[PDB]
């Protein structure tokens, strides 16, 4: 050990307490002009703190306000240098700053239940995907229709080789009672297309906005669940002629207890309903889609689907 | 403590308490599972 | 010490204080060196892997508590009475309670005689009238327990819904019990709580299971624990027979809890739902964790 | 489709943050795979309807933690035995023990063991149970036979379309056609006969337009799904002959020669599962068995498959070339292999192995996740074969 | 059912003979009350006088018969017996050319 | 001593200094005689041979570390809090970090409870408030490791090439990880480094493997270690299914390093590559090896 | 004296001296006794 | 008779060959003088170089043959061989209809 | 390497000579197996002695004539001294198969 | 020294370390060697 080296040491930090290194710990003979500085860095070496010691004849005293050290995390590595006059700095101690204080894990961590979610669906790959769970008619009731005759992207609907109605539940649930759904939809022919929010695990009860198109039945309803394939109209219908590529936003506001549907970029709800007798809360945050057609051909089908927590 | 006693006898394996009849019956059961469905009914 | 109190309630209901304030008042004290008493015995499974062996899971083992007591009195006749009472406080078929009281509360373990006790010294015990009994008891359920929390919800409406507040303060998962009255269609929560034991941790976060419609007089006990059958009708009817390959799969994971929804429909005379939630711990005492 | 530029913009131009985002996504995919691998199985017991109707009726569920031990093999074209050991205090063990002496119950029980949320299923009939005593501790060891044992008890008479004790002409029944179609057709004809020969057989059973839509197939316990005679893509043909031989014995040689697989699935409509592609596929009852002959090896296909390879350049594609008389087949390597990847390999969440493009190579080295028990090779034995007798 | 009469009062051959019906119970939950009535099919008297392991003359009964619970070796032996007899019968029923 | 510092970071994020500067400030110190702690256990294999037995290979075994800690405080209630916190710092399912810091740097080992801890003396622990806990922990990955070396190369060109400097300063081989953006076809090095495990030592000196052509949005992670699947796409597509039996076979051997080449082709946007080189060691501290 | 030594090893059973050859031969002899009289003479 | 030649002067293949008659004795009361003469049927040369169990090249003779003392596995295998051959012969002797 | 070597025939003969070739055990390779005991891998090789060739040599009703044309009579019968007749049956079958 | 310890345990034979798995596998291998050549190819 020919060359002098630092002594590995540790520092203690507390939230709300002033950081202080007493003078009787940094002894030695310090001539006038000696300067001591303490440097705190992170795992990458970035300096997250620097302080100056009060060098005296035989002691060095450190005293910083708690706000100066509140940003220094546990595990941040420190380095104490003493510089005699007309000399290069000499490191006396180095090590780690541990925090001796009440520990709050819940403050730093965020639970998966306490996280807003946002889901997308494009149907451009011509496959259903693992995120949609068929309901009402069982496995294999869903399908993708190309709509190659017109310049349109593939849409999702019932398996018209077997069924004329179907439902699909988004595999994962939401994390809020309030929810926004944005659907870009195509009106190929006559049918009924339900956007379903606040659904239970088996889609027995839910709120929904139903777009119905036909020879003379182009309108929008607010529906409640009676099963994945059954529903009950609530309130009066609103006339609406769906065109190919139409974007509808179904927003359920929990604190308002109101499910509304806006068409395109309109700032006024196309339809609106409030005070529906449907359970809400944990276990009632699933979402999905449903289709019902008289003929075995696509009616109103969603090309693009989007869901997000909150309104 | 563990190294050099029963905790390493366990690593040795079936040196102390271990029975022959149960092992033979287990081997017979595995063979019976393998061969029973392919034996004829006659 | 006054920081720890150990009691026994026998198969016959006798109350003994083995350690702590008031120990030895019934004549029996607890000797040192008791084993497998604090931590629940767990064996961890390991399977071969590229860098040795890979973790494969854990299996909790039943507790095998070997301890010793000392039965003492001033006269041999009363000593014999005390020893007989201590032996009567135990059995093989039926279990007796062993309570530990600390600043963290009171937690009990149900224990039974694993083998015959080993009493007395080499000479006849009437000489000393102060003799030790070596007890080898076992806990089939290895978790220390507190009294389970019971919640009652009675409704007169045909259709109703409630939110049961549920929370797991222990360090191990617990299995819920439901007592549902009949008639009526019940929907009970089976939330995964993030548990991924069926590869559906996020899919079953808000999972609800619908019990079969109950006819009049068919009150059901719905116990989620693997030891008991899920559905038991009080009248012996096969209620599980009408339930179409469905079950309660998820316990209450530690540190998790919410207002679980219970729904009742088609109930001409209302209905009552009781939720029993056990409080299971792996240690006789521990500070709450979250 | 989050592009690199989009991810970098979301991370505000920090390459390290963007790559940590990508690493987190990869980690969550790996964690999903591990959870799927380590998921517990779902063991469920079902029974026949006590009144004698169709549809299996749910008895109960055995917990994996509540089992003592279990063993379930899946074999290629071979029946296998599943073994499940329970404590006798278990409620399903008690039910099974009371079953023989319960006069209100049918005596047949079906086990269904589901892995990966029902994606893999082992279903089979009860073979027996045994009350075994290990050191005065009693447990119930229950043995099931997998659902391929039905083909042992299905047999093909010389004339499956006519009453058996009256006239069975000719001496043997012979059906020739594409391999999958002919095997499936033999099985279906025998299923028709044993269900009662109630209706008239069309020329091609799997030409679904030939079957009337008013027909009810709900009482059938077994079904067979296959393509029609013209639509079958089996490259090779087959001739199957029988004189009261069991169906599995009839089809074993053809399955081995064509490298075909019999897949059975018990459709639990109580779980929402449905079936399609066979007559009466919409009205099938709960727990009805469906058979399908598949080409999982793809050895006889026009594009061939992988028969060999090396760890430094992957698999090597070969195609079968038939010599004089088509008795002999050799392998010719495709020097310029230009087979397109399956469309399934471009779908999110896909994990299966397509027959045309095998991908799974399991490597053993110093750091290996598997253990290799034994690898044995043996050369061919006899150059020539004689078959005959009387002509 | 397989039973071993160690020191029970039952006297094989005297109380019960081969082929005669007897009932038996097993102390397993759900079937305590049931009595499985089978005709006695096997009874073996065995003893070992060796110094190492010594067992007095003891009887083991097997009531009822089952092809399923038969050992694989015994199943193969019985099947071989039946196949050999059937092969002899077919060969003797062959019509000469 | 001040030449060595041992810490535990529990499953809950708690920080304990068991030895070194500032040890025992959280109430728990480390008792002597800790085993299977320094060298990674390895068993060597031997086949019968003409001169006895012939060397067949080596296998690294998982670490089974048995060590004792001592939890202490002036008053029994604070001792109980300390003991509960120490218990909460450990688990069977999830691993906690064990960091050793010396003049060679800080290396961590991930350890989990192999079985239940054995706490306290023969008498109740509140008498002393200074009690030992015997811990049998296990390291499924038995190598001490440091933070890996990470390098990034982004480009805008449709076709480009780069060289990553790589060097194994440890005593054990390490397995490289890549993070590759999409779209684009990548050529990744799989240099043997002269390793003769496949009898292709200098045959595979400059081996490069072509990843399958990634479609838009299919950013992949390519981990060469055997614990994990090689190709995993972030969008869930089965990239390895299109990779016809190919794999990364060779680890970075100790003492070996070079400028490994990475090639990108058919990338209209111009992609990015990240290389992660682990720092695995068989000992808590060791001088760098050349 | 007896409890805790060879006298309880005897209760343990075949943990100390017991060889596999005699057990295998005895099981083979039992199987041969069971199956030999029913094997055909051909 | 089963014999194991450990270090005996007998050299199998040289002194005695397969099919050649030889006598053997057993040291049992009442048969010491008797010499059982059988033609040698089997001779196996076996060795094990493993460190745990090292067994130098040793010869084991079996003189004479008996179906009674044959192992059950060997008996079943030989029976299966004969039955398969007889089945082939009967099937080829079948007369067509 | 034999199974995957395309330049080699797949049949192998072992000859074990005792006493300088006076005693000889010769046979064809039946199979081999790579077996692992405690991560230690060895190769066990099974050969069939040369008497197995007589299992694969069979006697048709008329060994001197083509088989798929006419094999008369129904069975082939040869009578003579024991050694000569056995050797003669074997030789005629070897002649036919060559 | 040798008489009365592990050196006489070796005389005892397979009392200490000895497993059933390889013994059963070796017995099966010997039986397979005996019976495999005589088993028919059918």
The neighbour count for residue C267, using CB atoms within 10 Å, is 21
DSSP C184: B
Best mutation target among B20, B27, B30, B32 (most E Cβ atoms within 10 Å) is B32
The tokens describing D338, both together, are 């230009």
Torsions phi, psi for F2 (to 5 deg): -90, 5
Contact F162, F261 (CB under 8 A): yes
What are all long-range contacts of A150-154, with beta carbons under 8 Å and residues at least 24 apart?
A150/A244, A152/A186, A152/A244, A152/A245, A152/A303, A153/A122, A153/A123, A153/A124, A153/A303, A153/A304, A154/A123, A154/A124, A154/A126, A154/A303
Residue A154 CA to residue A297 CA, distance in Å, equals 14
| Interior angle at CA D94, CA D85 and CA C210, nearest 5 | 95
List the chains bordering chain C where 3 or more Cβ pairs fall under 8 Å: A, D, F
Q: Which residues pair with F109 in a beta bridge?
A: F98
The region, left, alpha or beta by phi > 0 then psi within -120 to 50, assigned to residue C287 is: beta
Contact C45, C58 (CB under 8 A): yes
Closest of E30, C230, E29 to residue D59, by C-alpha = C230
Elucidated via:
cryo-EM
Residue G36 CA to residue H1 CA, distance in Å, equals 20
The tokens describing A251, both together, are 């927003």
Residues in C touching D32 (Cβ below 8 Å): 199
The neighbour count for residue F287, using CB atoms within 10 Å, is 7
The tokens describing F26, both together, are 């959280």
Torsions phi, psi for D16 (to 5 deg): -65, -40
Torsion over CA: I76, I81, I85, I86 (sign): positive
Burial class (CB in 10 A: 0-12, 13-18, 19+), D141: middle
The tokens describing A247, both together, are 């974007």
Closest of C71, C17, C251 to residue C143, by C-alpha = C251
Q: What does the radius of gyration of chain F's CA atoms come to, in whole angstroms? A: 24
Residue with token string 């709900």: D218
The neighbour count for residue A117, using CB atoms within 10 Å, is 17
Torsion over CA: G29, G35, G36, G41 (sign): negative
Cβ density class A47-74: b for 16+ within 10 Å, e for less: eebebebebeeebbbbebeeeebeebee
- Give percent helix, percent strand, percent coil of chain J, each to the nearest 5: 55, 0, 45
Residue F19 CA to residue E25 CA, distance in Å, equals 65
Contact D255, D214 (CB under 8 A): no
Q: Name every residue whose Cβ is closer than 8 Å to that of residue F199 and which is 6 or more positions away in sequence.
A: none
Residue A92 CA to residue A6 CA, distance in Å, equals 5
Instruction: Provide the pairing of β-strand D245-246 with F63-72.
Output: unpaired
Contact I29, I47 (CB under 8 A): yes
H or E segment to which residue I83 belongs: helix I82-97
Torsions phi, psi for D376 (to 5 deg): -125, 135
Q: Give the distance, in angstroms, between the CA of residue A3 and the centroid of all CA atoms in the same chain.
A: 55
Contact C150, C156 (CB under 8 A): no
Residue C65 CA to residue C100 CA, distance in Å, equals 14
Closest of D217, D247, D292 to residue D150, by C-alpha = D247
- Report chain H's terminal Cα–Cα distance, integer Å: 52
| Interior angle at CA G19, CA G14 and CA G25, nearest 5 | 115
Contact C83, C90 (CB under 8 A): no
Residue with token string 């728990």: F28
Provide the greatest CA pair distance for chain B. 60
DSSP letters of chain F?
A: -TT-EEEEE-TT--EEEEESTTTTTTSEEE-S---S-SSPPEEEEEEEETTEEEEEEEEEPPEEEEEEEEEE-SSHHHHHHHHHHHHHT--SSS-EEEEEEETTEEEEEEEEESB--EES-SS-TTTTSEEEEEEEEEESS-SEEEEEEEEEEE--SSSEEEEEEEE--SSS-B--EEEE-SSBEEEEE---TT--TTS-TTTTTT-EEEPP-BPTT--EEEE-STTS-SEEETT---TGGGS-S------B-TT-EEEEEEEEES-SS--EEEEEEEEEESSSS-----
| CB-based contact, J42 to chain H, within 8 Å | yes
| CB-based contact, G27 to chain H, within 8 Å | no
Closest of D217, D172, D186, D221 to residue D199, by C-alpha = D217
Residue A175 CA to residue A283 CA, distance in Å, equals 10
Residue H6 CA to residue H61 CA, distance in Å, equals 11
Burial class (CB in 10 A: 0-12, 13-18, 19+), C151: middle
**Contact criterion met (CB < 8 Å) for D81 and B22:** no
Per DSSP, the three-state class of J31 is helix
Side-chain half-sphere of E11: how many Cα atoms within 13 Å?
Answer: 3
CA torsion angle J20 J24 J27 J33 (round to 10): -140
Best mutation target among A130, A283, A285, A288 (most C Cβ atoms within 10 Å) is A283
Contact D93, D125 (CB under 8 A): no
Residue C130 CA to residue C119 CA, distance in Å, equals 11
DSSP letters of H9-59?
A: S--BTTTB-TT-EEEE----TT-SS--EEEEEEEEEEEEEE-SSSEEEEEE
The tokens describing A274, both together, are 């409030």
Q: What does the radius of gyration of chain G's CA atoms come to, in whole angstroms? A: 18
Whether B contacts E, i.e. 3 or more CB pairs less than 8 A apart, is: yes
Residue D7 CA to residue D288 CA, distance in Å, equals 50
Torsions phi, psi for D258 (to 5 deg): -90, 0
Q: Give the distance, in angstroms, between the CA of residue D120 and the centroid of all CA atoms in the same chain.
A: 9
Residue D183 CA to residue D295 CA, distance in Å, equals 13
DSSP letters of D239-299?
A: EEEESSEEHHHHHHHHHHHHT-EEEEEEE-GGGT----SSTTTTSPPTTEEEEEEE-SS--
DSSP letters of C44-93?
A: EEEEEETTEEEEEEEEE--EEEEEEEEEE-SSHHHHHHHHHHHHHT--SS
Q: Give the distance, in angstroms, between the CA of residue D24 and the centroid of all CA atoms in the same chain.
A: 36
3-class secondary structure for C21-33? CCCCCCCEEECCC
Q: Edge to edge, what strands does the sheet with E55-63 contain?
A: E2-5, E55-63, E36-48, E21-24
Best mutation target among D375, D380, D382, D390 (most I Cβ atoms within 10 Å) is D375
3-class secondary structure for I1-50? CCCCCCCCCCCCEEEEEECCCCEEEEEEEEEEEEEEECCEEEEEEEEEEH
Contact F137, F114 (CB under 8 A): yes
Q: Name every residue whose Cβ is closer than 8 Å to that of residue D289 and which is 6 or more positions away in sequence.
A: D123, D147, D150, D221, D222, D223, D264, D265, D266, D267
What are all long-range contacts of C17-21, with beta carbons under 8 Å and residues at least 24 apart?
C18/C69, C19/F124, C20/C101
Contact C111, C94 (CB under 8 A): no
Q: Which residues pair with A304 in a beta bridge?
A: A184
Q: Edge to edge, what strands does the sheet with A118-121 contain?
A: A118-121, A300-309, A179-187, A246-253, A258-263, A271-274
| CB-based contact, D87 to chain C, within 8 Å | no
Residue H41 CA to residue C110 CA, distance in Å, equals 70
Q: Which residues pair with A291 in a beta bridge?
A: A166, A193
The neighbour count for residue F284, using CB atoms within 10 Å, is 21
- Report chain C's terminal Cα–Cα distance, integer Å: 29
Residue F98 CA to residue F84 CA, distance in Å, equals 19
Closest of C213, C162, D118, C188 to residue A201, by C-alpha = C188
Contact H56, H31 (CB under 8 A): no
The tokens describing B22, both together, are 């149960």
Residue among G13, G24, G27 whose CB faces B19 most closely? G13
Q: Give the distance, in angstroms, between the CA of residue D127 and the centroid of all CA atoms in the same chain.
A: 20
H or E segment to which residue D63 belongs: none
Closest of A204, A4, A171 to residue A93, by C-alpha = A4
Q: Name every residue whose Cβ is closer than 8 Å to that of residue H75 and which is 6 or more positions away in sequence.
A: G36, G39, H67
CA distance A309 to chain C (A): 15
Per DSSP, the three-state class of I55 is helix
Show the DSSP H helices in C174-286 as ranges. none
Q: Give the distance, in angstroms, between the CA of residue A22 and the centroid of all CA atoms in the same chain.
A: 47
Side-chain half-sphere of H95: how many Cα atoms within 13 Å?
Answer: 7
Residue F54 CA to residue F48 CA, distance in Å, equals 6
| CB-based contact, E46 to chain G, within 8 Å | no
Instruction: Provide the pairing of β-strand A35-41 with A47-52.
Output: antiparallel
DSSP letters of D185-240?
A: HHHHHHHHHHHT--S---S-TT-TTSS-TT---TT-SEEEE---TTT---SSEEEE
Last residue before each break in chain D (C–N > 2.5 Å): none
Residues in B touching F136 (Cβ below 8 Å): 2
The tokens describing H86, both together, are 């007889």
The region, left, alpha or beta by phi > 0 then psi within -120 to 50, assigned to residue F199 is: left
DSSP letters of D67-89?
A: EEEEE----SSS--EEEEEEETT
Kindly list the distances between the CA atom of residue A120 and the CA atoms of A172, A307, A310, in Å, as whole numbers in the listed order: 12, 7, 15
Residue with token string 């639509």: D231
Q: Give the distance, in angstroms, between the CA of residue E57 and the centroid of all CA atoms in the same chain.
A: 18
Residue D154 CA to residue D142 CA, distance in Å, equals 24
Closest of F191, F201, F197 to residue F261, by C-alpha = F191
Side-chain half-sphere of A190: how many Cα atoms within 13 Å?
Answer: 7
Closest of A67, A94, A59, A61 to residue A13, by C-alpha = A67
| CB-based contact, B4 to chain E, within 8 Å | no
Q: Name every residue whose Cβ is closer than 8 Å to that of residue D38 and which is 6 or more positions away in sequence.
A: none
| CB-based contact, H54 to chain F, within 8 Å | no
CA distance I12 to chain F (A): 24
Residues in D touching A141 (Cβ below 8 Å): 274
Residue D282 CA to residue A140 CA, distance in Å, equals 12
Kindly list the distances between the CA atom of residue F83 and the CA atoms of C1, C89, F90, I5, in Å, as whole numbers in the listed order: 17, 33, 11, 66
Whether C contacts A, i.e. 3 or more CB pairs less than 8 A apart, is: yes
Residue D67 CA to residue D85 CA, distance in Å, equals 6
**Contact criterion met (CB < 8 Å) for C163 and A283:** no
Show the DSSP H helices in chain A as ranges. 66-69, 105-108
Per DSSP, the three-state class of D25 is helix
Instruction: Provide the pairing of β-strand F118-119 with F160-167.
Output: unpaired
Contact C280, C170 (CB under 8 A): yes
The tokens describing H4, both together, are 């194991």
Residue A53 CA to residue A50 CA, distance in Å, equals 10
Contact F89, F14 (CB under 8 A): yes
CA torsion angle D159 D160 D162 D165 (round to 10): 80
Residue C207 CA to residue A202 CA, distance in Å, equals 8
DSSP letters of F115-165?
A: B--EES-SS-TTTTSEEEEEEEEEESS-SEEEEEEEEEEE--SSSEEEEEE
Residue F197 CA to residue E23 CA, distance in Å, equals 67
Q: Edge to edge, what strands does the sheet with A35-41 contain?
A: A7-13, A90-99, A77-83, A35-41, A47-52
Cis amide bond preceding G13, omega within 30: no
Torsions phi, psi for A80 (to 5 deg): -105, 120
Whether H contacts I, i.e. 3 or more CB pairs less than 8 A apart, is: yes
Kindly list the distances between the CA atom of residue C216 and the CA atoms of C178, C181, C187, C234, in Å, as whole numbers in the listed order: 18, 9, 17, 11
């Amino acid at each position: 050990m020919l060359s002098t080296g630092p002594i590995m040491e540790t520092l203690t930090l507390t939230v709300g307490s002033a950081f202080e290194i007493p003078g009787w710990k940094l002894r030695g003979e310090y001539p006038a002009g000696t300067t001591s500085h303490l440097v705190f860095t992170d795992a990458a070496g970035g300096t997250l703190g620097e302080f100056e010691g009060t060098v005296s004849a035989k002691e060095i005293h450190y005293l910083q306000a708690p706000d100066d050290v509140k940003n220094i995390p546990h595990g941040a590595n420190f380095q104490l240098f003493v510089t005699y006059p007309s000399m290069q700095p000499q490191c006396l101690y180095f090590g780690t700053a541990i925090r001796k204080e009440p520990r709050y894990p819940l403050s730093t961590v965020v639970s998966p239940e306490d996280s807003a979610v946002q889901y997308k669906a494009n149907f451009v790959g011509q496959y259903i995907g693992p995120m949609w769970k068929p309901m009402g008619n069982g496995w294999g009731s869903l399908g993708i229709h190309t709509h190659a005759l017109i310049s349109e992207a593939p849409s999702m609907g019932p398996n018209y080789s077997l069924f004329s109605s179907a439902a699909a539940r988004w595999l994962w649930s939401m994390n809020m009672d309030s929810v926004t759904i944005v659907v870009r939809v195509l009106n190929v022919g006559a049918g009924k297309f339900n956007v379903i929010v606040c659904a239970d695990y088996q889609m027995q009860t839910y709120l929904g906005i139903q777009f119905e198109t036909g020879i003379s039945n182009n309108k929008v309803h607010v529906i409640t669940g009676d099963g994945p394939l059954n529903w009950g109209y609530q309130g009066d219908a609103v006339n609406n002629t769906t065109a190919n590529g139409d974007v509808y936003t179904i927003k359920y506001n929990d604190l308002l207890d109101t499910i509304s549907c806006y068409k395109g970029t309109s700032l006024t709800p196309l339809i609106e309903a409030s005070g529906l007798d449907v359970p809400h809360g944990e276990g009632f945050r699933y979402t999905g889609l449903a289709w019902n057609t008289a003929l075995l051909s696509p009616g109103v089908e969603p090309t693009a689907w989007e869901a997000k927590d909150g309104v | 403590s563990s190294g050099g006693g029963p905790a390493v006898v366990n690593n040795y394996g079936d040196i102390h308490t271990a029975n022959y009849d149960e092992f033979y019956k287990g081997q017979q059961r595995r063979e019976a599972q393998q061969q029973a469905p392919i034996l004829p009914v006659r | 010490t006054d920081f720890l109190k150990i009691e026994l309630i026998g198969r016959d209901g006798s109350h003994w204080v083995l350690s702590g304030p008031g120990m030895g008042q019934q004549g029996v004290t607890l000797n040192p060196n008791l084993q497998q008493f604090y931590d629940a015995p767990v064996k961890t499974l390991y399977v071969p892997g590229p860098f040795g062996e890979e973790y494969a899971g854990k299996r909790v083992q039943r507790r095998e508590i070997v301890f010793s007591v000392q039965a003492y009195d001033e006269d041999p006749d009363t000593w014999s009475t005390v020893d007989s009472l201590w032996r009567w406080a135990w059995d093989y078929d039926e279990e007796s309670e062993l309570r530990v009281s600390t600043s963290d509360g009171t937690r009990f373990l149900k224990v039974r005689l694993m083998e015959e006790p080993k009493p007395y010294y080499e000479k006849d015990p009437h000489i000393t009238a102060d003799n030790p009994i070596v007890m080898t008891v076992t806990a089939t359920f290895p978790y220390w327990q507190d009294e389970p929390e019971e919640l009652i919800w009675t409704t007169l409406s045909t259709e109703d819904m409630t939110r049961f507040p549920v929370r797991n303060d222990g360090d191990v998962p617990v299995w819920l019990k439901w007592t549902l009255t009949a008639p009526g269609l019940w929907i009970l929560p089976d939330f995964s709580w993030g548990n991924d034991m069926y590869s559906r941790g996020r899919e079953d976060l808000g999972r609800t299971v619908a019990m079969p419609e109950l006819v009049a007089g068919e009150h059901v006990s719905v116990d989620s624990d693997p030891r008991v059958q899920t559905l038991i009708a009080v009248n012996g009817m096969p209620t599980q027979n009408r339930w179409k390959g469905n079950d309660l799969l998820y316990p209450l994971m530690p540190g998790k809890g919410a207002e679980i929804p219970v729904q009742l429909k088609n109930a001409p005379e209302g209905g009552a739902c009781k939720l029993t939630r056990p409080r299971w711990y792996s240690r006789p005492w521990s500070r709450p964790g979250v | 489709a989050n592009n690199w530029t989009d991810i970098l913009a979301a991370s505000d131009g920090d390459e390290w943050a963007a790559f940590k985002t990508i690493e987190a996504q990869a980690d969550e995919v790996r964690a999903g795979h591990q959870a799927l691998r380590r998921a517990k199985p779902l063991i469920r017991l079902w029974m026949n309807n006590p009144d004698g109707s169709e549809g299996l009726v749910y008895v109960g569920r055995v917990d994996y933690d509540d089992t003592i031990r279990g063993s379930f093999p899946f074999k290629n074209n071979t029946p296998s035995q599943g073994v499940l050991e329970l404590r006798d205090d278990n409620y399903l063990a008690v039910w099974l023990k009371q079953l023989p002496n319960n006069p209100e119950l049918k005596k047949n029980v079906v086990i269904t063991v589901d892995f990966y949320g029902g994606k893999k299923r082992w279903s089979g009939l009860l073979d027996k149970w045994t009350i075994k005593s290990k050191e005065h501790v009693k447990y119930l060891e229950v043995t099931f036979n997998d659902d391929l044992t039905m083909l042992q008890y299905l047999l093909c008479p010389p004339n499956p379309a006519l009453p058996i004790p009256v006239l069975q002409f000719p001496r043997i029944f012979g059906i020739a056609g594409p391999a999958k179609w002919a095997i499936s057709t033999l099985i279906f004809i025998n299923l028709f006969r044993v269900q009662g020969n109630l209706w008239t057989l069309p020329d091609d059973p799997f030409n679904l337009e030939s079957w009337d839509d008013i027909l009810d197939w709900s009482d059938w316990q077994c079904f067979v799904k296959s393509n029609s005679f013209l639509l079958d893509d089996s490259s090779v043909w087959t001739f199957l002959s029988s004189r009261m031989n069991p169906v599995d014995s009839i089809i074993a040689d053809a399955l081995d020669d064509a490298q075909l697989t019999i897949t059975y699935r018990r459709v639990l409509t109580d779980d929402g599962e449905t079936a399609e592609g066979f007559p009466g596929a919409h009205g099938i009852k709960n727990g009805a068995l469906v058979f399908e002959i598949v080409d999982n090896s793809n050895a006889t296909a026009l594009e061939g498959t992988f028969f060999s390879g090396t760890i430094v350049d992957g698999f090597a594609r070969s195609v079968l070339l038939y010599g004089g008389g088509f008795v002999e087949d050799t392998l010719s390597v495709v020097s310029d292999d230009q087979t397109l990847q399956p469309d399934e390999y471009y779908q999110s969440g896909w994990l299966a192995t397509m027959a045309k493009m095998p991908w799974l190579v399991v490597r053993d080295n110093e750091w290996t996740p598997i253990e290799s028990s034994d690898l044995s090779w043996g050369p061919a034995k006899n150059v020539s074969v004689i078959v005959g007798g009387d002509n | 059912h397989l039973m071993a009469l160690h020191d029970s009062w039952i006297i094989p051959g005297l109380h019960i003979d081969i082929g005669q019906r007897m009932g038996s119970t097993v102390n397993s939950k759900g079937v305590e009350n049931i009595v499985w009535v089978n005709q006695l099919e096997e009874m073996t008297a065995a003893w070992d006088n060796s110094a190492g392991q010594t067992m007095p003359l003891s009887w083991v009964l097997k009531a009822g018969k089952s092809d399923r619970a038969m050992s694989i070796g015994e199943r193969v032996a019985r099947l071989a017996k039946k196949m050999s007899e059937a092969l002899n019968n077919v060969g003797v029923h062959i019509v000469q050319s």
